[PDB]
Design a protein around this ligand. Structure first.
Ligand SMILES: [Mg+2]
Ligand SMILES: [Mg+2]
Ligand SMILES: [Mg+2]
Ligand SMILES: [Mg+2]
Ligand SMILES: [Mg+2]
Lengths: 211, 226, 196, 222, 204, 195, 233, 125, 195, 196
C-alpha cells in the first residue's frame, strides 16, 4: 500500500514495506519510496523492478535537464518524461503504478499518478496498491488542507496501518516522508507490529482486536 | 518411492524405502509402506497414497471374510483378482499401483498391478519414482534359484539404488520375507543409512520467551458430579 | 506389440512377442500375451492391457459357464462373445483381439476382432503396432495347408521382422500350437530369431 | 512446444555480519527427480572481494555470473584498475538483468562482500533486476524453510526477555563469523532433511578484509 | 480459486515427554481481505484434539460431523474415543468422499488414556494418514512450519519447554505467510490437565 | 445484488442494504428491499445471483416460520444462523448451487444481546461486531475498525453507518442508489425511513 | 522451435584412474520405428577428445560438421596445431556450450544432449555435459536420456565420489559401462544391441571400438512365465 | 413373483404373547446343550458334537465359530440358522466397525449388532 | 473514459463530459477534464482507452497549434475534423491502434456557423446536430430526438442537456460524478462552472 | 506414396507408384514422382508436392551451375545440396527425399533424406506412406550386387505390396535405371504387378 497527499505544509508520502510472491512473504523490509533526487519522490507499486529501474532512470533525466537548463525540473515535466517512456512500451507488459511527488516554486506541492497503461493524473490525494481502499477510508474522512505537518504525518501513518491490518499483502513497517520546497525529509521506519498496539491503546481503536 | 519384489528358492521378498513426500517436501522420513493384505500376503504401493491404503484395507477385509467363509488360507490370486476388478471398474481414477507378494497353500507368488486394472507376473519387479534405479540393479544381479539371504541382499540393494539416485525416495529400507511353510517376517528399518547428524547448536528456548495474553484450563472431562 | 495366428493342416498356431512398454520404458520384457479362454480356444491381446485382460477374463467365465450347460463351445462362439463385449463397449475399450481355436469338425480357425468390434474370419491374422511392417512379408509367404514346422517358421520369420522394426515389440517369441494332439507352448530367444 | 527454461534446484544463503559476509549454497544439481551432479559449485569469487550466486535455471545463472565477471574486468580496463565497490556491482547487475526484461534470466541472484566502510553487505535481486541491500537472504528451493528460521535466530523476532512477558524484546546482539557459520550449517541440515532437492554438499564462501576463504561440508546424499 | 488457500490458516502439533501440544492461528479471510481474528481451528471431543486447516465451510462442517460421530460413539461404547481410533475414523470419513472431497488438512493430537502414550497424526484431504512421532504441520504456511519445526524440535521436551518451541514455530511461520496470523492459540496437553494459551503477535 | 452492511451496537443490530436492481445495461429499480424477516426478532439481508437470492431468502423464512408455529417458540439468532449455514453448505456441492451471501441480525431475548452473523455462499459463518459482503468491506472496514465501540448507542451506530455509506458513494464506481436501513432490537424490527 | 524427428538415445560415460570412457548405441529412431541401424554417435575430435551426442540426428550431423571445421580452423597459421596449441577437450566443450545456449536464446535449439569426454594436456580427465537448454554440469559419471535414470545408478556404485576415481581401473570401468549398455538394451524401447565405445587414456591415448554387441543376456526365466495372474497351461 | 409378503408374520396375540418368538424358543429347548463359563483370565464355551451318522466327518461341522480374533460363538437350536448368522456377524464386524475404526469391535457391540439382526427377523415383512 | 455528449444549437456548440476516472475498483478522481482546445474556436472532447485518449488528444492539439503558427490562420472545424479522422483511420491498421473516440465542437468564423463532428476510433466521421459516444446515446437520443430544434438558444441547449444528464444519472449503473460543460461560439471557448 | 531406390552391380534403380491424393480423392493417377536433377542423378519425392517440386527445381539449378563451373557433380554432392535445403528450412518443409545417382568411380549410390534433413547413405532405401508395409519384405529379400533383372523384380514385388495395402499408393509402377549404359525409363501396369 502506498499513498501521497497534498496539504498546507507540502506533501506527505507514506508506504508499507511488504513484498509477496503468492502467499509467500518474500520481504518485510522493502523500500517502496524511491528517492529520485533530493527534491523528488516516487512510490513503488505493481512491478518492483519496473518501478525501481525507470524511476532511477527518471532521476538521471532530471539531472540532465537541470544541467542543460540551469533550473530545477518541474514535477509536471518530470512525470511526463516517465509517462511518455512507459507509453512507448505499452502492450509489452510493464507493470507500474506510481506517484511522482515534488514541491517547486512555480507549481507549489504537486503529485502526479503515473501508470503503465499511460495514464498521467494530477491530484491532491492518491492511494495505490492491494490495500488502497482501506487507506482511502481513513484518509477521506480525516483529510483537511489545513493539517499541521505533525497531524499530516500521523494521518499518513494511520492510513497505512489500516491497510496493513486488513490487507493480507500489506504490512511489515511504515516509511514516512515529508516533501517541502527545499527537499524531502525522512520521518523514519515504524514497525507495524509495535505501531498497531501503540495506536490501539492511545487511540482506543481496533476494539475488535484483543490486546 | 522405491518398491521391489524378488522371488527366491522357497518364497518371495518385498522391500520399500521410507520417505513420503508432499511435492518436493518430505512429510514423513520414516513411513512404513509395506502393508498387510493378510498374514502371509503383503503389498507396497506407489501413486496416490490414500488409494493404495484404502484399496489394501478393502481387499484385506474381504479376503479375511472370504477365508473365514471357505475355511481356507487366503490365496494371492484372490487378492489379485479382487484388486484388478475393483480398479478396472473405476477406470484408473483410483490411483493405486501395487506390488503384491505372498505365499499360500498353492506356493509363492509375485504380481504387479497398475491403476487401470492390468496385472503382470514376474520373478523380480519394481515400482515408484525410483523403479528405474532399482530395476537397473535387479537386471544386473538377479539370477534363477536365489537363496533367501541373496534375495534380501538383492532387494535391499535395489531399494538403496532408489534411495541414493531418486529424489522421490529416501531414508530407510523396510523388508518383508515370506518363505513357504513359515511365518512372514516383517523387518522394519532393516537398513538405516541416513541418521541426521547432530546440529551445531541447541534451539531450546529460555522459558518466558513467548508473549502470552491469556491462560485457561480446558475442561476435557465430562460433567462433574454434585 | 506383435501378435499373429495362422491356420495350418493340423490346426492353428498363435504367436506373439513379449514386450510391454510405458512410453519408451520396457515395463515388462517377458510378458505372456497368449491367453487361454478355453482348453483349445486361445487369444492374442493388443491395445489396453487392462481392457484386454478384463475382456479375456469375462470370456473365460462365459465359456466355462457355456461348457457346464451345453458342452464344448465352437471357436465361432468364442469369437462371438468377444465381439459382443468389444462392440457394445466400443466407446470405453481399446482392444484388438485375435481368437484362435481347434475343433474336430471345423479344424483350426482364426477370427480377428479389430478396434470397432467387427469380426472377420481369416486363414491367418496379424495385429499390434509391429504388424504394419509385415503385411507385405506375410501376404507373400503365407500358403494354405502348411505343415507344423513350416507354420512355426513362417510365424518366427514374421515376428522376427516385426520385432526388428517396431520399438514397442521385442523380447522372446512365444507360440501356442493347437491341434488334435493337444496344446504345446513354444518359446524362441533373441539369439535364435535375430540372425534369421 | 519448446520451453527455453528449466529448474536445476539448489538453495543459497547470504548473511551479512559486522565486518564479514558469508554466501553459501548446496552443491547438488538436479532436473525433475534425478541428480545431475553431487558437486557442481554454485557460489563464485568474482574478483574485487565480491562473491556471487545466481540460483534457479542454471544455464541463465552461469550466463549471468559469466557476464558479471566480464563486467568487473572491463571496469578495471575503463577506470584505471579502480576497485568495484559492492554497491556499484549491485547497480550494474540490475542493468544486466533488466536488459533482458522481456526474456528474463530465470534466476534469484545474491551477491556478498564488504561495503566501503568495511561492513558486511548482502544484496538480493529478483529475476528482472529489482534489488535491495539486506542483512539476511535465502534463495531457491528451500528459501521458505530457511527464512523464518533466520528471522527467529538472527533478528530474534517473537523472542522477548523472560519475566517481562512481552514488554521487552530480546536485544539484537552482534554475531561472530563462527556463530553465523553454525546457523548456516543448521539451516542447510534442516533444509536437507525436509526438501528433496537439497543435499550432497555445502560450500561456503566467507568474505573479510583479508579476502575470500572457502569452507566445505558434507550433507546427506539421499 | 484453489479452495484450500481461499481462507488461509495453519495448524501444528508436537510430541514431548508425557505430553502433546497443538497450535493454530486465528485468521479467517476471503483471499486478501481479513474477515475474522477469532476463527479457532482446533476442536476437541473428550480428550482427543483435532485441528483443521483449509476451506472454512468444510472446517466447520467436519467439526460438526466428528462431534456427531464421537457423541454416538460414546453412547454406544460407554467410553470416550481414543486418539488412535479417532484417527482411523477421520481417515474413513474423508475417503468416503473420495471423488467430491472436503478441502481440509486435519491434524489429530492426544494422549491415550490407558497407555499414557502421546499421539499425533496428519491427513491429506482424501484420508491418507501421516503418523510422524515428532511433529505434524498443515495449512498455507506448511513449508515455513516444516522449516521451523525441523530446526527447533528436539525429542522429550517438558510441557513448558514444548510450549515455547511450538509457539516460536507457529509464530515465525505465520509471519512469513500472508494468509496466516491475526492471533494464535496453543494447547498444552497432559494426561489429566489441558492448558490453553493465546499468544501476542503482530496484527498485519 | 451489491452492498449489504451490518453493525452490532450495545442493544441492537443495524442492517443497511442497497436499493438498486441492475439488469446489465439499465437500472430497473431504485427502491428494492433486499431483506426478509425470519422471526419477530431476526432479520436477514442478502446479496448474490439474480433469482437465487430471493428464492433462498423466502425458503429460509418459510422454514423458520414453520418452526415457530410447530414449537410456539422463537429460535435464537445463533440457531437460525446455524440452520442457514447448513443449507448453504449443503447447496455448494449441489447440482446447481445457491450463489447467495447473507447477514443475519437478531436480538436474542434469552441472553438480552444483539447478534450479527456473516455467512457467505460457501457456508462460511462468522459472528462479528460489524460485517459486509463483496467489495463493501474493502471501503468501510477501516472506518469501522477506527470508530467502532462495543458500547455505542443506536444513534451512534447510525452515524458511523452514514460515514460508511458516504465513503462508498465517493469511491465505488457503481451507483447503488442509497440504502434501506433497518434496526433489530428487543422490541423487534423497524425501518429507518430517512437516510 | 521444432520437434526432433530422427533421434538417438542414451550416451553414457565415466571417469577412471587414468582417463575417461564413453559409449552410445548405433540406432537412429523415427518415432517408434527403428529406422536406421548404422549410426555412429561418438565423434572423436583429434586424439584426446570424444563427443557423444543424443537427440536429433540432423542436428548431430550439423554439430559434427562444426567440430570438423573447428579442427581445420585451429590449424590455420598455427605451427603448434599438433602440439601445445592443439584442441583441448575443455575448448571444444566451451565452444559447444556457447552455441547451445545461443541457439536456445534465439528460440531455435539444437535438439541434443551432449557429453564431451577427454584428457587435458596436463593428464587431467575431462567429462562435462551440455544440452539443448545450454545447461551444463560435471560429475564422475554422466549419462543422457534413459541412461541418466538406469546407467548412473550402476556407474555410481563404482565411482560414487571424487576420491573413488584413482581406485578405479580401466577394466572395472569398461566392464561397468558394458553392463550398463546391457541393462539399457533390456529396458529402453529405443535402444539397439549394437554400440560403439571409446576410451581416452592419458598413457595409451584414444581407443575407439566399433561394432560391439550386448552379450550374456538372461532370457531363460521367460519360459516359466505363464499368463498374467491366474492362468496355468 | 416379487416377494409380496411385506407384512409381519410375528404378531401379538390377545394375551400379549409374540407366538413365533415363543415357538422359536421352543426349538432352542430341543437343541443340543451348549454352555459358557467366565474365568478371571479367560472364557470357555463348549457344546456336544452330536453327529447325525457315523459316516459323517463331524470335524467338517463347526458348532463353535471364530467371529473375530478375540470373539467366538456357540449355539443351541437350528444349525443352519446359526451358520448364516455367523456369516452375517463376521461381515457386520467389518462393514459397521473395522472399516470405520481400523480395529475389531468390542464384544458387547458385536453382540448388539447380531441382536439387531435377530430382532429385525421378528418384525420385518 | 465514459460519457461525452455534444449538441449544436443556433449559434454555439455545447460539449458535456463526465468527471470520473476509474482504475478498476476505485474512483481515482472526480474532477477530470476530458477535453483539449485545438484552436481558439475549436474544442475536442474524448473517451476510450486509458493513456491513449490523452496521448492522442495532445498529439492532435500539437499538430493544429503548429499549423496555426505556420500559416498564421485558424483551420476550419471541418478541416480539423478531417485531419483527426485521417489519423484515427491510419491508426486502426497500426501495430497497436489508438482506441479513442472524439467529439469536435467548433465555431466556423468564415461561415458563422457552429459545427459538431462525431468521430469514433475506427475513423468513422459524421456531422450531427447532437452526438454521443459509447452507451450515452442509448439513454439520451430519444430526448434529443424529441426536444431538439435547430434554432435553440444556448440556454435552451443547456436545459435540454440537464435533462439528458438527469436521465443518465437515473438509468446508468456507473456513477460518473457529474459533467463539465463547455460552450464554443463566435467569441471562443468558455466553461459553464455550475452544473 | 511408395518410393524406393536400390543399388545393384551395374548401378542403381529408382522406383515409384503414380498416385497422388487429396484426402480420399485421387487427384492424379499417373503422376511422375521420379525427377531428374542431373543427367544421372535422380530423386524420388514424398511429402508436400509443392515443397518437393520447389526443392527439386532449386537443386537442379544448383547442379546445372555447379556443372558449368566445376564439371559433373558427385551423387554425394547432390545429396548435400538437398540436405542443406531440407535442414535449414525444416520448420517450413514437409519433404522426404531419396537421392540416387551413378558415377564411374563410385558406381550406384543411394542417399535418403528424411523429414528432419538428416542424410543417410544406404545400399537401398524406401519411403512414403506405403513403405511401412514392406520393411519386413525388403529386409528379407534385398541382396547386394543383384543383376538388373533381379533388381527390377525386387522393386516390382516390393512396390506391388506397398500399393496393395496403402490406399495412398497405386496406379502404375515407374522405374528409372541408372548405369554406365545410360538412362532407361520403365513402366509396369496394374494387370502385370497385381497378380504377383
Ligand atoms: Mg520520455
Ligand atoms: Mg533419494
Ligand atoms: Mg497485512
Ligand atoms: Mg461514429
Ligand atoms: Mg492402393
Amino acid at each position: 500500500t502506498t499513498l501521497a497527499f497534498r496539504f498546507q505544509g507540502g506533501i506527505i508520502v507514506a508506504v508499507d514495506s511488504r513484498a509477496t510472491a503468492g502467499n509467500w512473504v518474500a520481504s518485510q523490509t522493502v523500500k517502496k519510496v524511491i528517492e529520485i533526487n533530493p527534491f523528488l519522490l516516487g512510490t513503488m507499486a505493481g512491478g518492483a523492478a519496473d518501478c525501481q529501474f525507470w524511476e532511477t532512470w527518471l532521476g538521471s533525466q532530471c539531472r540532465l535537464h537541470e544541467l542543460r537548463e540551469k533550473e530545477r525540473i518541474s514535477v509536471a515535466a518530470a512525470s511526463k518524461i516517465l509517462s511518455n517512456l512507459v507509453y512507448q512500451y505499452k502492450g509489452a507488459g510493464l507493470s507500474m503504478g506510481t506517484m511522482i511527488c515534488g514541491y517547486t516554486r512555480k507549481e507549489g506541492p504537486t503529485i502526479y499518478y503515473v501508470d503503465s497503461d499511460g495514464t498521467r493524473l494530477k491530484g491532491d490525494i492518491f492511494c495505490v496498491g492491494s490495500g488502497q481502499t482501506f487507506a482511502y477510508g481513513v484518509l477521506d474522512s480525516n483529510y483537511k488542507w489545513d493539517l499541521s505537518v505533525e497531524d499530516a504525518l500521523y494521518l499518513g501513518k494511520r492510513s497505512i496501518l489500516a491497510a496493513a491490518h486488513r490487507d493480507a499483502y500489506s504490512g511489515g513497517s511504515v516509511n514516512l516522508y515529508h516533501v517541502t520546497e527545499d527537499g524531502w525529509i525522512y520521518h523514519g521506519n515504524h514497525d507495524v507490529g509495535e505501531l498497531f498496539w501503540k495506536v490501539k491503546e492511545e487511540e482506543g481503536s481496533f476494539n475488535n482486536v484483543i490486546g | 518411492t522405491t518398491i521391489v519384489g524378488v522371488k527366491f528358492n522357497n518364497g518371495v521378498v518385498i522391500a520399500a524405502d521410507t520417505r513420503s513426500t508432499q511435492g518436493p517436501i518430505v512429510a514423513d522420513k520414516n513411513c512404513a509402506k509395506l502393508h498387510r493384505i493378510s498374514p502371509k500376503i503383503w503389498c507396497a504401493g506407489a501413486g496416490t497414497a490414500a488409494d493404495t491404503e484404502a484399496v489394501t484395507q478393502l481387499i484385506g477385509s474381504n479376503i479375511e471374510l472370504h477365508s473365514l467363509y471357505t475355511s481356507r488360507e487366503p490365496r494371492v490370486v484372490s487378492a489379485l483378482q479382487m484388486l484388478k476388478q475393483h480398479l478396472f471398474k473405476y477406470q484408473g481414477h483410483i490411483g493405486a499401483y501395487l506390488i503384491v507378494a505372498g505365499v499360500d497353500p498353492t506356493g509363492s507368488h509375485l504380481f504387479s498391478i497398475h491403476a487401470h486394472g492390468s496385472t503382470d507376473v514376474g520373478y523380480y519387479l519394481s515400482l515408484g519414482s525410483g523403479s528405474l534405479a532399482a530395476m537397473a540393479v535387479l537386471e544386473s544381479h538377479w539370477k534363477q534359484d536365489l537363496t533367501k539371504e541373496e534375495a534380501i541382499k538383492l532387494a535391499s540393494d535395489a531399494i538403496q539404488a532408489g534411495i541414493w539416485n531418486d529424489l522421490g525416495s529416501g531414508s530407510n529400507v523396510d523388508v518383508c520375507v515370506m518363505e513357504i511353510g513359515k511365518d512372514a517376517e516383517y523387518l522394519r528399518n532393516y537398513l538405516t543409512p541416513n541418521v541426521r547428524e547432530e546440529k551445531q547448536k541447541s534451539y531450546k528456548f529460555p522459558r518466558g520467551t513467548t508473549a502470552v495474553l491469556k491462560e485457561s484450563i480446558v475442561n476435557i472431562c465430562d460433567i462433574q458430579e454434585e | 506389440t506383435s501378435i499373429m495366428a495362422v491356420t495350418f493342416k493340423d490346426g492353428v498356431i498363435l504367436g506373439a512377442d513379449s514386450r510391454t512398454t510405458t512410453g519408451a520404458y520396457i515395463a515388462n520384457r517377458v510378458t505372456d500375451k497368449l491367453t487361454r479362454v478355453h482348453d483349445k480356444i486361445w487369444c492374442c491381446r493388443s491395445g489396453s492391457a487392462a481392457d484386454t485382460q478384463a475382456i479375456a477374463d469375462i470370456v473365460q467365465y462365459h465359456l466355462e459357464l457355456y461348457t457346464s450347460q451345453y458342452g464344448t463351445p465352437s471357436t465361432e462362439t468364442a469369437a462371438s462373445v468377444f465381439k459382443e463385449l468389444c462392440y457394445e463397449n466400443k466407446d470405453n475399450l481399446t482392444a484388438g483381439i485375435i481368437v484362435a481355436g481347434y475343433d474336430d469338425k471345423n479344424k483350426g480357425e482364426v477370427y480377428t476382432i479389430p478396434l470397432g468390434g467387427s469380426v472377420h474370419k481369416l486363414p491367418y491374422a496379424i495385429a499390434g503396432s509391429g504388424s504394419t511392417f509385415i503385411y507385405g512379408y506375410c501376404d507373400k509367404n503365407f500358403r494354405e495347408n502348411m505343415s507344423k514346422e513350416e507354420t512355426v517358421d513362417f510365424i518366427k520369420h514374421s515376428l522376427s521382422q516385426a520385432i526388428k522394426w517396431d520399438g514397442s515389440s521385442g523380447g522372446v517369441i512365444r507360440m501356442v500350437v493347437l491341434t488334435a494332439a493337444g496344446v504345446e507352448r513354444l518359446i524362441f530367444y533373441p539369439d535364435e530369431y535375430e540372425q534369421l | 512446444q519448446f520451453n527455453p527454461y528449466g529448474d536445476n534446484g539448489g538453495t543459497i544463503l547470504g548473511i551479512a555480519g559486522e565486518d564479514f559476509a558469508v554466501l553459501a549454497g548446496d552443491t547438488r544439481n538436479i532436473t525433475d527427480y534425478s541428480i545431475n551432479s553431487r558437486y557442481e559449485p554454485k557460489v563464485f569469487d568474482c574478483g574485487d572481494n565480491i562473491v556471487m550466486s545466481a540460483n534457479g535455471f542454471a544455464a541463465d545463472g552461469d550466463a549471468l555470473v559469466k557476464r558479471f565477471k566480464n563486467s568487473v574486468k572491463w571496469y578495471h580496463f575503463d577506470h584505471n584498475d579502480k576497485k568495484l565497490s559492492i554497491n556499484s556491482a549491485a547497480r550494474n547487475i540490475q542493468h544486466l538483468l533488466y536488459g533482458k526484461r522481456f526474456f528474463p534470466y530465470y534466476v534469484h541472484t545474491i551477491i556478498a562482500g564488504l561495503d566501503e566502510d568495511g561492513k558486511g553487505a548482502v544484496y538480493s535481486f529478483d529475476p528482472v533486476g529489482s534489488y535491495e541491500r539486506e542483512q539476511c537472504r535465502a534463495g531457491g528451493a528451500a528459501a521458505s524453510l530457511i527464512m523464518p528460521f533466520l528471522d527467529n535466530q538472527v533478528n530474534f523476532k517473537n523472542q522477548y526477555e523472560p519475566g517481562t512477558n512481552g514488554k521487552v524484546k530480546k536485544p539484537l546482539k552482534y554475531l561472530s563469523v563462527e556463530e553465523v557459520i553454525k546457523l548456516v550449517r543448521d539451516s542447510f541440515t534442516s533444509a536437507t532433511e525436509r526438501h528433496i532437492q537439497v543435499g550432497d554438499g555445502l560450500e561456503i564462501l566467507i568474505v573479510t578484509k583479508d579476502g575470500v576463504r572457502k569452507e566445505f561440508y558434507e550433507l546427506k546424499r539421499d | 480459486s484453489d479452495p484450500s488457500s481461499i481462507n488461509g490458516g495453519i495448524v501444528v502439533a508436537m510430541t514431548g515427554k508425557d505430553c502433546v501440544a497443538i497450535a493454530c492461528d486465528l485468521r479467517l479471510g476471503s483471499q486478501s481481505l481479513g474477515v475474522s481474528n477469532k476463527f479457532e481451528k482446533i476442536f476437541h471431543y473428550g480428550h482427543v484434539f483435532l485441528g483443521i486447516t483449509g476451506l472454512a465451510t468444510d472446517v466447520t462442517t467436519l467439526n460438526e460431523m466428528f462431534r456427531y460421530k464421537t457423541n454416538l460413539y460414546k453412547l454406544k461404547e460407554e467410553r470416550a474415543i481414543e486418539p488412535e481410533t479417532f484417527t482411523q475414523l477421520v481417515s474413513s470419513s474423508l475417503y468416503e468422499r473420495r471423488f467430491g472431497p472436503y478441502f481440509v488438512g486435519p491434524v489429530v493430537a492426544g494422549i491415550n488414556s490407558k497407555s499414557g502414550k502421546p499421539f499425533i497424526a496428519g491427513f491429506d484431504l482424501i484420508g491418507c494418514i501421516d503418523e510422524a512421532k515428532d511433529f505434524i504441520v498443515s495449512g498455507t504456511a506448511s513449508d515455513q512450519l516444516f522449516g521451523m519445526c525441523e530446526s527447533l524440535y528436539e525429542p522429550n521436551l517438558e510441557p513448558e519447554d514444548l510450549f515455547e518451541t511450538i509457539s516460536q514455530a507457529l509464530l515465525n511461520a505465520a509471519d512469513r505467510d500472508a494468509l496466516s496470523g491475526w492471533g494464535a492459540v496453543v494447547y498444552i496437553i497432559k494426561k489429566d490437565e489441558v492448558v490453553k494459551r493465546y499468544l501476542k503477535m503482530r496484527q498485519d | 445484488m451489491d452492498i449489504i452492511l451490518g453493525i452490532r451496537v450495545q442493544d441492537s443490530v443495524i442492517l443497511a442494504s442497497s436499493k438498486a436492481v441492475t439488469r446489465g445495461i439499465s437500472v430497473l429499480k431504485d427502491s428494492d428491499d433486499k431483506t426478509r424477516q425470519l422471526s419477530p426478532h431476526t432479520l436477514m439481508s442478502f446479496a448474490g445471483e439474480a433469482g437465487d437470492t430471493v428464492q433462498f431468502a423466502e425458503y429460509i423464512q418459510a422454514n423458520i416460520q414453520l418452526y415457530s408455529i410447530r414449537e410456539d417458540y422463537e429460535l435464537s439468532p445463533q440457531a437460525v444462523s446455524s440452520f442457514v449455514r447448513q443449507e448453504l453448505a449443503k447447496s455448494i456441492r449441489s447440482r446447481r448451487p445457491y450463489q447467495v451471501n447473507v447477514l443475519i441480525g437478531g436480538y436474542d431475548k434469552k441472553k438480552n444481546k444483539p447478534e450479527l452473523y456473516q455467512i457467505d455462499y460457501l457456508g462460511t459463518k462468522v459472528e462479528l461486531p460489524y460485517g459486509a459482503h463483496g467489495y463493501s468491506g474493502f471501503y468501510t472496514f477501516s472506518l469501522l475498525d477506527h470508530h467502532y465501540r462495543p458500547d455505542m448507542t443506536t444513534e451512534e451506530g447510525l452515524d458511523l453507518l452514514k460515514l460508511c455509506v458516504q465513503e462508498l458513494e465517493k469511491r465505488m464506481p457503481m451507483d447503488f442508489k442509497g440504502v434501506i436501513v433497518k434496526i433489530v432490537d428487543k422490541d423487534g424490527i423497524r425501518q429507518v425511513d430517512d437516510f | 522451435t521444432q520437434q526432433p524427428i530422427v533421434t538417438g538415445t542414451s550416451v553414457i560415460s565415466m571417469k577412471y584412474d587414468n582417463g575417461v570412457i564413453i559409449a552410445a548405441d548405433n540406432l537412429g529412431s523415427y518415432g517408434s520405428l527403428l529406422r536406421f541401424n548404422g549410426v555412429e554417435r561418438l565423434i572423436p575430435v583429434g586424439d584426446n577428445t570424444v563427443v557423444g551426442i543424443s537427440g536429433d540426428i540432423s542436428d548431430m550431423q550439423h554439430i559434427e560438421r562444426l567440430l570438423k571445421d573447428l579442427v581445420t580452423e585451429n590449424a590455420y597459421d598455427n605451427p603448434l596445431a599438433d602440439a601445445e596449441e592443439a584442441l583441448e577437450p575443455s575448448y571444444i566443450f566451451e565452444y559447444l556450450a556457447t552455441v547451445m545456449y545461443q541457439r536456445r536464446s534465439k528460440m531455435n535449439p539444437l535438439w541434443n544432449a551432449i557429453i564431451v569426454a577427454g584428457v587435458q594436456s596436463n593428464g587431467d580427465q575431462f567429462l562435462r555435459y551440455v544440452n539443448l537448454l545450454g545447461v551444463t554440469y560435471s560429475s564422475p559419471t554422466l549419462a543422457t536420456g534413459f541412461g541418466a535414470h538406469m546407467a548412473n545408478p550402476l556407474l555410481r556404485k563404482v565411482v560414487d565420489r571424487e576420491s573413488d576415481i584413482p581406485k578405479t581401473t580401466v577394466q572395472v570401468a569398461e566392464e561397468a559401462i558394458v553392463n550398463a549398455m546391457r541393462v539399457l538394451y533390456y529396458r529402453d524401447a529405443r535402444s539397439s544391441r549394437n554400440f560403439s565405445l571409446a576410451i581416452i587414456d592419458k598413457n595409451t591415448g584414444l581407443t575407439f571400438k566399433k561394432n560391439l554387441q550386448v552379450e550374456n543376456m538372461k532370457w531363460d526365466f521367460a519360459k516359466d512365465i505363464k499368463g498374467y495372474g491366474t492362468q496355468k497351461i | 413373483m416379487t416377494d409380496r409378503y411385506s407384512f409381519s408374520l410375528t404378531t401379538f396375540s390377545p394375551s400379549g404373547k409374540l407366538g413365533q418368538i415363543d415357538y422359536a424358543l421352543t426349538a432352542v429347548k430341543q437343541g443340543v446343550t451348549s454352555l459358557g463359563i467366565k474365568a478371571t483370565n479367560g472364557v470357555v464355551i463348549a457344546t456336544e458334537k452330536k453327529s447325525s451318522s457315523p459316516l459323517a466327518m463331524s470335524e467338517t461341522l463347526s458348532k463353535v465359530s471364530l467371529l473375530t480374533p478375540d470373539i467366538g460363538a456357540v449355539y443351541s437350536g437350528m444349525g443352519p440358522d446359526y451358520r448364516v448368522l455367523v456369516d452375517k456377524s463376521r461381515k457386520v464386524a467389518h462393514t459397521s466397525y473395522k472399516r470405520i475404526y481400523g480395529e475389531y469391535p468390542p464384544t458387547k457391540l458385536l453382540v448388539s449388532e447380531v441382536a439387531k439382526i435377530m430382532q429385525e427377523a421378528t418384525q420385518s415383512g
